[PDB]
């Protein structure tokens, strides 16, 4: 269809054009490259095209042919393609302009040759390596490119062969390269010591970097390549980084004093060479990194990787000899300088090592004196680089509400914890030095020499991280001093801006020292009351700080709020509850809810149940009065929920209940009961209004402010119920009182809602119910299935994309139903059990991990359930009806291109299914005295031959043979499956590959 000139035009349009025409050219190119017979256009393209991009694409088409259908080709074609690719590579190498400016095409060509080597070498090309080595002496460019070829070969065989090749083929190629590496190393070594050309030597070092991953130690330690690397190539600016990378891998390669002294030697040479030719230990790397000449940033990255890797493995080697003391401390001084570089990922690399060191010094304090200056330096470095321990996300939800929420397990948070751990160690190693550094840094905030918001915050985070380290008495003197200075600093600073910053840090520090707070009630009470005072401060961030600190402190110190302290006439929680209208008057709703949540934490600490309920009652007085009032108004006004102000008040009422229930859990029951029935009634009301309007106006009604206000009420109600039930201690009251009205209210409404009004949160609510009490409500589970299964399935069985949330929640619900209450399927008509099996297989076919995990898990659990029933009519009938359905469907997703995330579960499921037959657990023939074993093999062989006709009969037999012998060894069984996955994508696969485990 497309001749050469037109292809060149399409390529040029795609890469250099834009917009619609670029898009149109792409679709032409994609079709062209995917054409099975396109490879015959390839050599003509490679011969005649005036476009390097066209040639790149031609090589891709060639690669497809080589990796998939090489063995179909006559031996003439193979040699022809072979000679052509080799010839093409050589031409580009002798062409100096092309060699310099078309590296991507030459690399692509080299990779193509390596693909051929994977097919032909060495059994059909035994002289390749000798032919490669001698061709290197013909031209300096061919020699350089040969290093690239050898590099790619090593990568494809050792680095990326797993899952790309069968285990047998991979072993074959690894052993092949192992047998001929002797002469490869000779060429590599020779070039390294003789070589003039920078680009040649760099390329040689790049290849060696990959060899080091797998080559025998003797090539590294019984030659003198280590000495050559550590002396010659560090003085050179173009080879420094790549040499450090090689030595780093060497530092990851015993009872051997020779190898020990060589390990010491290359480190000694490298460090000496760096100090001599590159930079001294006193070099400001922080500034050097910041200017970033050429690739200096990468060199310093590679240096930190080298030092940390070596020292983590070989520090004890350098310590066992005092002549190496200078080398040891210089290495660590370099690390100190590197740790000052403003580059997080670089800093994290050093920190991982400092953690190793200071832990060792703690458990071996006799070595401590050696590193005293290093540690003192390190204390300051970490203190000055402490990151924030807490992060908050500000997001708009689906109802248009702006919501704060704390980040969990982020990189920043993990970094804080690592920094804290090191600082905790360092504090114990020398508490005086630690205290002196923090105090003097604080003094430099006071005198203004180092004053900034970032620096005072950073220091606060550092100080707040070492609680429980100094002993209680030293801690007391330390915190008193710190709070004193910070209080004076607040007075000293001009501007509400700066004052708020220091004040927030005062509050942060005290919140980090609960032992200090608990020991002194008057001070703790003073802290809380000032936080209350801050809740009236409109200055940005202050109220959030006050509320965050409040709940943080009560989390640690709750006990002191429920008991009656000395010189108090009542537990302070009573004081808090009474003034709650005044305290929270200026807060935003979300902040008020946090306040109530904090009170809930405290009230849960009351051991007397009568008094706990009384406290809860008093706490909820304001929202209950608002709720009671609105309940009364509901009787007097049928159009009550059309008032947006009323809707908003009701929303905040429920949110307040959710907040308190979150912290109180099981203790929240009496409050829940006070509103439960009216709340459920409210739910049906607002959900009806939503569904009615969505039906009349369509999907766009979901975005309207009115509907979103109603859906907020709807979702908060479900959230409240879910929150309590998940925390309930009394499951009887859940079942006997809560569940039945809940199911009637939400399941019926969900069922009668129009599809675009059904909330997936209902399914998630039901999942929580079933998880908690599903084993106690078999009839309730059935009602759930009757209400949500078919109507939800019909929403998600047209495509794989629509209603993404219902899809996830649907199969989460099905999983826990199948887990906790499988009895529900035993009572249901066959037509519905069929729908159940259909739904599972439908989840298999998703390119959606969140859906596919549960689909697999359900299938696994289902087979486990039925197998458990034993020799019983239901189990036996299931086997006749569905055994091969699951077998073939599992084999389908296994062999399909994009279901790799479920591979582990698929393999397990297949093992389990095979177990049912080859362990004779199925008491009944599966076919309409032939044993089930041989009918299974016949089914599979026929299934596989049909689906993959290019497979030989011996391939299939050998595969099924291995499978039915390995179904109890997961690791081996997986390996056999991966081998099969490799072989179904190519032609002429070796059937003896499946004997890999046995030999």
């Amino acid at each position: 269809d497309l001749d050469i000139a037109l292809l060149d035009q399409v390529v040029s349009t795609f890469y250099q054009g834009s917009g619609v025409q670029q898009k149109q050219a792409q679709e032409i190119l994609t079709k062209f490259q995917d054409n099975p017979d396109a490879w015959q256009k390839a050599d003509q393209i490679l011969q005649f095209s005036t476009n390097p991009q066209s040639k790149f694409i031609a090589l891709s088409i060639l690669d497809k042919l080589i990796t998939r259908k090489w063995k179909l080709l006559p031996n003439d074609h193979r040699i022809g393609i072979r000679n052509f690719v080799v010839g093409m590579i050589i031409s580009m190498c002798q062409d100096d302009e092309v060699f310099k400016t078309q590296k991507n095409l030459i690399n692509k060509s080299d990779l193509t040759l390596v693909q051929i080597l994977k097919q032909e070498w060495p059994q059909n090309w035994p002289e390749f390596i000798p032919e490669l080595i001698g061709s290197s002496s013909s031209s300096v460019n061919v020699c350089e490119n040969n290093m690239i070829v050898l590099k790619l070969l090593s990568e494809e065989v050792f680095d990326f062969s797993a899952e790309q090749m069968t285990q047998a083929k991979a072993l074959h190629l690894k052993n092949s390269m192992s047998k001929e590496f002797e002469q490869i190393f000779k060429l590599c070594f020779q070039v390294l010591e003789q070589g003039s050309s920078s680009s040649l030597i760099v390329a040689t070092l790049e290849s060696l970097l990959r060899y080091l991953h797998w080559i025998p130690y003797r090539y590294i330690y019984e030659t003198n390549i280590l000495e050559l690397l550590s002396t010659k190539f560090m003085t050179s600016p173009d080879t420094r980084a790549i040499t450090l990378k090689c030595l780093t891998e060497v530092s990851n390669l015993q009872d051997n004093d020779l190898i020990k002294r060589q390990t010491v030697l290359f480190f000694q040479n490298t460090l000496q060479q760096i100090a001599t030719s590159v930079m001294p230990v006193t070099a400001d790397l922080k500034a050097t990194y910041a200017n970033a000449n050429g690739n200096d940033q990468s060199f310093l990255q590679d240096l930190a990787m080298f030092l940390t890797t070596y020292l983590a493995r070989n520090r004890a080697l350098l310590e066992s000899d005092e002549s190496l003391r200078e080398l040891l401390l210089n290495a660590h001084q370099y690390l100190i300088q590197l740790s000052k570089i403003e580059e997080r990922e670089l800093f994290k690399t050093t920190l991982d090592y400092w953690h190793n060191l200071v832990a060792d010094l703690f458990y071996e304090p006799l070595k401590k004196h050696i590193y005293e200056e290093i540690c003192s330096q390190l204390r300051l470095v970490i203190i000055e680089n402490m990151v924030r321990p807490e992060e908050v996300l500000v997001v708009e939800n689906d109802e248009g509400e702006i919501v704060r929420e704390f980040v969990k397990e982020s990189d920043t948070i993990q970094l804080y914890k690592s920094e804290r751990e090191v600082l905790v160690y360092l504090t114990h190693l020398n508490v005086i030095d630690t205290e002196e550094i923090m105090i003097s840094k604080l003094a430099r905030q006071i005198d203004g020499s180092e004053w900034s918001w970032h620096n005072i915050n950073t220091l606060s985070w550092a100080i707040g991280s070492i609680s429980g380290t100094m002993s209680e008495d030293t801690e007391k003197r330390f915190v008193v001093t710190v709070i004193k200075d910070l209080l004076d600093l607040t007075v000293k600073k001009r501007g509400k801006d700066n004052k708020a910053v220091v004040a927030s840090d005062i509050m942060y520090v005290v919140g980090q020292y609960p032992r200090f707070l608990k020991a002194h009630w008057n001070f703790l009470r003073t802290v809380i009351l000032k936080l209350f005072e801050f809740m009236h401060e409109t200055h940005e961030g202050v109220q959030d700080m006050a509320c965050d600190t409040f709940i943080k402190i009560v989390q640690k110190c709750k006990y002191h709020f429920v008991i009656q302290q000395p010189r108090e006439s009542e537990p302070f929680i009573q004081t808090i509850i009474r003034d709650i209208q005044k305290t929270t008057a200026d807060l935003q709703p979300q902040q008020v809810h946090t306040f109530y949540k904090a009170c809930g934490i405290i009230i849960s600490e009351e051991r007397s149940v009568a008094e706990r309920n009384r406290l809860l009652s008093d706490l909820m007085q304001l929202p209950n009065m608002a709720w009671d009032t609105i309940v009364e108004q509901s009787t007097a006004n049928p159009t009550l929920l059309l008032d947006s102000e009323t809707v908003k008040i009701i929303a905040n009422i429920i949110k307040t209940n959710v907040a308190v229930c979150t912290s109180m859990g099981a203790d929240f029951y009496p409050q829940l009961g006070h509103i439960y029935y009216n709340m459920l009634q409210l739910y049906r009301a607002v959900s009806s209004m939503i569904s009615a309007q969505v039906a009349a106006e369509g999907l766009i009604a979901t975005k309207t402010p009115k509907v979103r206000g109603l859906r907020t009420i709807k979702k908060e109600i479900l959230k409240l119920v879910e929150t309590y039930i998940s925390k309930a201690r009394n499951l009887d009251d859940v079942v006997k009182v809560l569940v039945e009205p809940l199911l009637n209210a939400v399941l019926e409404d969900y069922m009668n809602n129009v599809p675009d009004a059904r909330d997936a949160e209902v399914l998630n609510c039901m999942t929580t119910v079933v998880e908690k009490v599903g084993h106690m409500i078999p009839q309730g589970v059935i009602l759930i299935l009757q209400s949500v299964f078919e109507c939800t399935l019909d929403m998600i069985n047209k495509d794989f994309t629509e209603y993404p949330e219902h899809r996830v929640e649907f199969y989460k619900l099905l999983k826990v139903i199948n887990e906790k209450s499988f009895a529900a399927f035993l009572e249901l008509p066959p037509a519905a059990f069929k729908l159940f099996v259909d739904a599972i297989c439908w989840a298999f076919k998703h390119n959606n991990r969140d859906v596919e995990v549960n689909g697999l898990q359900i299938a696994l659990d289902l087979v486990k359930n039925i197998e458990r029933m034993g020799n019983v009519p239901f189990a036996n009938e299931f086997h006749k009806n569905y055994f091969f359905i699951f077998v073939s469907e599992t084999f389908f997703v296994l062999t399909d291109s994009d279901h790799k995330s479920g591979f582990s579960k698929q393999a397990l499921l297949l093992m389990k299914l095979i177990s049912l037959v080859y362990d004779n657990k199925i008491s009944v023939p599966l076919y309409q005295g032939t044993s089930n074993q041989v009918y299974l093999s016949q089914y599979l062989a026929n299934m596989l031959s049909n689906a993959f006709p290019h497979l030989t009969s011996e391939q299939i037999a050998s595969f099924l043979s291995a499978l039915t012998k390995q179904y109890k060894d997961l690791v081996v069984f997986k390996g056999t499956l991966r081998d099969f996955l490799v072989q179904i994508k190519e032609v002429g696969g070796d059937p003896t590959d499946y004997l890999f485990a046995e030999d």
């Binding site: 004052k499 002194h520 401060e537």
Partner: peptide
């Protein structure tokens, strides 16, 4: 005891103009 410190803390005021 920390009465002196508690008193100082109680005086914490970001709206005073005594910088």
């Amino acid at each position: 005891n920390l009465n002196e410190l508690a008193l100082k803390l109680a005086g914490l005021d970001i709206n005073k103009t005594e910088g």
